[PDB]
Design a protein around this ligand. Structure first.
Ligand SMILES: NC(=O)C1=CN([C@@H]2O[C@H](COP(=O)(O)OP(=O)(O)OC[C@H]3O[C@@H](n4cnc5c(N)ncnc54)[C@H](OP(=O)(O)O)[C@@H]3O)[C@@H](O)[C@H]2O)C=CC1
Ligand SMILES: NC(=O)C1=CN([C@@H]2O[C@H](COP(=O)(O)OP(=O)(O)OC[C@H]3O[C@@H](n4cnc5c(N)ncnc54)[C@H](OP(=O)(O)O)[C@@H]3O)[C@@H](O)[C@H]2O)C=CC1
Ligand SMILES: CC(C)[C@H]1COC(=O)N1c1ccnc(N[C@@H](C)c2ccccc2)n1
Ligand SMILES: CC(C)[C@H]1COC(=O)N1c1ccnc(N[C@@H](C)c2ccccc2)n1
Lengths: 398, 399
């Protein structure tokens, strides 16, 4: 088997837990040997360890640079009573990002037989977003926002609003330079890693100081640190006003990175393609990545699975979490064998869908869900078997 | 002719001004007579009156309740050079909106043969936008605070925004008045009742629990005290959504709801700004100002001056009139004018659905680069065809 090296894996919850184990059993473990740092972030085990497993998983990603994560339940009030949780544990994803830093980039997987929301988008678009004290104003009065330098030599007082005719609400927000810089570095690394050009969108016409700082810091870091590496790959970096970016992006064919300063997984859910959207946290050092599906645990399918009904859950996004993590491991290690495997598994997935073997969501995307009949699609396990069979052929032929 | 009553009109600039006159002369005046209160907000008349004609027009709307407005040039540094005018006057639409107040609602015009960005959207969705931050650079370490000082001399309240311990960054403050939020709510309920469609408000009140929670609370309070009964009598409702759920729900919907949001760009990228209409809906439920959501279409106006054939879409400008006229008809219980407004909209939709369209519409079918001259009509050709179809429909209606 391929010697794969150090990968941090995080097990999860409900329907994605099922698919995750299938991915390891049928598509990864038959071909790759991993020095696997495996952490169980299932809700019950987070409860039993008082969420310590989540913090330990994040520490492992930092040490070993490659994380692949299965979808996890984020507790709310009803989860607390469903599992009798000791408390409403915080989102594992927030815990991990707070420890790793970095920027989340989402990317759709595109197949030629599958409609796109914007049909001219024939190459994927990779979108990353940059990730407040608010209060109630009880009645008339001035709200002001002040800055006091550490030396105390000055004191600038900006008027937010003079409320004259009632109360309302107000808020202050901020960003540290370092956070903007990290967002730049991650974005530049994303673009170099994929070999695609990079756009930053802001509303610097309106937030001239706040958003102009994003623009200035991106351009300064580009000029000092990345411009040669971009010109070596014949890619480029530009700023856009968000108004123009949206119009230009919709007239584009795709194949660019879009760093967005002001969600896309919500459009995917509305469109019915969450199972085809992957996600990757990109740390600004360019070394550490955490890959995962953009969707959740798919509870509604899992209740169906629990009741004996047939499930047609799309495993592609979860598969591409593995391939993206392994491809990155291959890049850090110059593992040609691994790189070939990771790429081959992505090709197999797209070839299989493009030959008409797909889950119910993809069939509904072609035909519309009302017109979908059961023979137009495979169920979760049929689809995985077909992918396993096509992966066996593809790897054997080389 | 049909008696129309009192309508405030605002003429405008460049390509829209030319479309504007073709509409009155071919589509409105042959069949309707109006107590028309006209105001010329063309850039020249706006300079030559120190932008006074603009605020007179806004007062006329306040008084007469119905305004219809052509698109107007907003001045920038290149505009002042163009007409050698005396100042970089403010947007006529900002002037108008702070005299009247109220919420801008946008609505696309749908035709069966013109593809939609979301195929399942067969009925229009109406988006209501609430519409000022103070932002600055933080140059180095220090404290950013935001404070509230009551106007009655009582104790100021201080909120820590951030201690910058190393380096600087940026900060800003934002605000919203209860009255603006209450007006937004009223305008939104009014708009949902006039159309007979349910209403959704979207916020992110899970993160900004005080700021956005204020919007959610004001909408709900006002809904219960003054609107729930009238809503339940048109089989519609009001509900609040987190923005994530609202985006998903909306894309799975069929359309036909009001979305109060706490859009133009997507229309421009999709190529459908010519099919996008707008209406300023004041909180009283009596005053509207209707207009195309697009601008003066400068780029086509230049082709018009250089003797080039143009194919600028007039539908959204026509619907400024029809929506203004429909609202004027509802105020006056004028059934004859309500019929004309509705019929001019249906004529417009049907003409397109029969294959007679301007070049942008043809491009939604064939693809932006793939239109040829035989696929569409030019601006004046299209107006004639509307005019002919409008005559035929009004003749066949007296039965
Ligand atoms: N990164 C993470 O760990 C995330 C975890 N979550 C967690 O997931 C749980 C459930 O969240 P929920 O709001 O239902 O969001 P999910 O994304 O889990 O599911 C939402 C809907 O999108 C469709 N969908 C999502 N994934 C697939 C797929 N792989 N194949 C086919 N269809 C798919 C299904 O729609 P349909 O019903 O129409 O088939 C599904 O019901 C929650 O506990 C939440 O905390 C949520 C987001 C991220
Ligand atoms: N409420 C108002 O009065 C508004 C006025 N304006 C003003 O209008 C002027 C021009 O602004 P601009 O940025 O060009 O915005 P416009 O909305 O006038 O035009 C933008 C582009 O969108 C397309 N488009 C818009 N309307 C139509 C239509 N009716 N038929 C066909 N295509 C259309 C055209 O694209 P293509 O180039 O592909 O043909 C046009 O070049 C400015 O002076 C601005 O201040 C702007 C917004 C609102
Ligand atoms: C609309 C989107 C959910 C999917 C479904 O259908 C498409 O055409 N989609 C495409 C097509 C290419 N590239 C993407 N990338 C993602 C990250 C994206 C999300 C949101 C906006 C832009 C871009 N999405
Ligand atoms: C995408 C949009 C520009 C037009 C063009 O294509 C459509 O199918 N569009 C539709 C279809 C129904 N309803 C709308 N309403 C507008 C106000 C809107 C704009 C933006 C978002 C939501 C809703 N737009």
């Amino acid at each position: 088997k391929i010697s794969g090296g150090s990968v941090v894996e995080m097990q999860g919850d409900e329907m994605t837990r099922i698919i995750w184990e299938l991915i390891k059993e049928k598509l990864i473990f038959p071909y790759v040997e991993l020095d696997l740092h495996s952490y169980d972030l299932g809700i019950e085990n987070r409860d039993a360890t008082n969420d310590q497993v989540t913090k330990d998983a994040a520490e492992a990603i930092k040490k070993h640079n490659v994380g692949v994560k299965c979808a996890t339940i984020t507790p709310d009030e009803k989860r607390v009573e469903e599992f009798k949780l000791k408390q409403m544990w915080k989102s594992p994803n927030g815990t991990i990002r707070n420890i790793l830093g970095g920027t989340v980039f989402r990317e759709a997987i595109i197949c030629k037989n599958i409609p796109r929301l914007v049909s001219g988008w024939v190459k994927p678009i990779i979108i990353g977003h940059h990730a407040a004290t608010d209060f109630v104003v009880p009645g008339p009065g001035k709200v002001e926002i002040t800055y006091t330098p550490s030396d105390g030599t000055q004191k600038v007082t900006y008027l937010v609003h003079n409320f004259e005719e009632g109360g309302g609400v107000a808020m202050g927000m901020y960003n540290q330079d370092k956070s903007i810089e990290d967002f730049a570095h991650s974005s530049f690394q994303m673009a170099l890693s994929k070999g695609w050009p990079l756009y930053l969108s802001t509303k610097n016409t309106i937030l001239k100081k706040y958003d102009g700082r994003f623009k200035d810091i991106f351009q300064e870091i580009y000029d000092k640190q990345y411009k040669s590496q971009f010109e070596a790959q014949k890619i480029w970096y530009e700023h856009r006003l968000i108004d123009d970016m949206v119009a230009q992006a919709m007239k584009s064919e795709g194949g660019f990175i879009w760093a967005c300063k002001n969600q896309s997984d919500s459009v995917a859910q509305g469109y019915g393609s969450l199972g085809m959207m992957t996600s990757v946290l990109v740390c600004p050092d360019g070394k550490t990545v955490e890959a995962e599906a953009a969707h959740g645990t798919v509870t509604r399918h899992y209740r169906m699975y629990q009741k004996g009904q047939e499930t047609s859950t799309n495993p592609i996004a979860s598969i591409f979490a593995w391939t993206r993590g392994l491809a990155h491991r291959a890049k850090l290690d110059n593992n040609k064998e691994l790189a070939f495997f990771a790429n081959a598994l992505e090709e197999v997935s797209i070839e299989t869908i493009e030959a008409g073997f797909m889950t119910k969501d993809l069939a509904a995307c072609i035909k519309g869900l009302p017109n979908v009949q059961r023979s137009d699609y495979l169920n979760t396990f049929e689809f995985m078997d077909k992918l396993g069979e096509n992966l066996k052929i593809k790897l054997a032929q080389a």
